[PDB]
Amino acid sequence: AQSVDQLIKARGKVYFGVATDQNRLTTGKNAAIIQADFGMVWPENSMQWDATEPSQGNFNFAGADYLVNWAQQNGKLIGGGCLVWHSFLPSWVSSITDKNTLTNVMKNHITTLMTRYKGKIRTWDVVGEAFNEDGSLRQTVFLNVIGEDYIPIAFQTARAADPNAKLYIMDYNLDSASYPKTQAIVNRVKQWRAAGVPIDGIGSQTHLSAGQGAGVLQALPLLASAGTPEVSILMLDVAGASPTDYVNVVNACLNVQSCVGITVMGVADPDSVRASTTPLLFDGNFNPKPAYNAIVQDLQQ
Ligand SMILES: O=[N+]([O-])c1ccc2nn[nH]c2c1
């Protein structure tokens, strides 16, 4: 059984990665599969805001430290995130109505996480899910209280905290070139970078239904046209796990020079949030599914 990470490196890419955390690494056969087959790990939950700063200035790094130490011992690259994401905010953040207060809170959260792991993290997802489906900016507490400047502020703060890390904006429903969100993230990233905002990458949080892989072949080149040094596929899963969809996503990555790699949402189907759709690359016995073998064969050829 061949390693997709090794094979994608042989094709000139950086990694094939996976999301995990302490719970997964101590159960099933997740650790053994990650050791063999994946070259980068991301914390699924242990670096989100609610996990790391459940009360203001009272940080909890136990789960994140476990992941980082496991990755270093096993020679894996590490991704971290998401530093600013409305979906994982504790209530103490959402209640803040004062611009200066919230700006300092946000800067402190960013700097504290990034400093702790300085030099050890390849990629940080700095801002997540900042766009509405129509391409307008999502009206989260950060937009409502700080305004549109919160995104530049987050990236400039992140660059200062660890200049080694590649800083990404991420979003979902960027899977079709003509979708309004895809157009808008491309346009705004172009503008931010032209003003000197340090956005190194766009990460596409790719949750596909059956048959949607084909559209990624056109959407990913469009995302790359924003001119960031890197793009990536993140959080990848596919309802039904058809080889056709998975191979299309891999081929999109191969066709886009700036696409550094792909991260899947987990290891085995039963641990998915949509397990009924069996959307991952390993089954409930931890055997590689037809889609895994198809990706291997595509990368070997
Ligand atoms: O690619 N990922 O699986 C992944 C998981 C959780 C994250 N939080 N921020 N960015 C993330 C990427």
Percentage beta strand: 15-25%
CATH superfamily name? Glycosidases
By CATH, the architecture is named Alpha-Beta Barrel
Q: Main β-sheet: number of strands, strand sense, barrel status?
A: 8 strands, parallel, barrel
The small molecules bound here are: 6-nitrobenzotriazole
Overview of the structural elements:
There is one protein chain. With 301 residues, the protein is an alpha/beta fold. The protein has one domain: TIM Barrel (Alpha-Beta Barrel). The chain has 13 helices and eight strands. It has helices at residues 4-10, 22-25, 30-37, 49-52, 62-73, 91-94, 99-116, 141-145, 150-161, 180-194, 213-224, 243-255, 290-300; strands at 15-20, 40-43, 77-84, 123-128, 166-172, 201-208, 230-238, 259-264. The chain has an eight-stranded parallel barrel with strand order 1-2-3-4-5-6-7-8, surrounded by seven helices. Helix 12 (243-255) links the parallel strand 7 and strand 8. Helix 1 packs parallel to helix 13 and helix 12 (243-255) packs parallel to helix 13 (290-300). It is globular. It starts with a helix and ends with a helix.
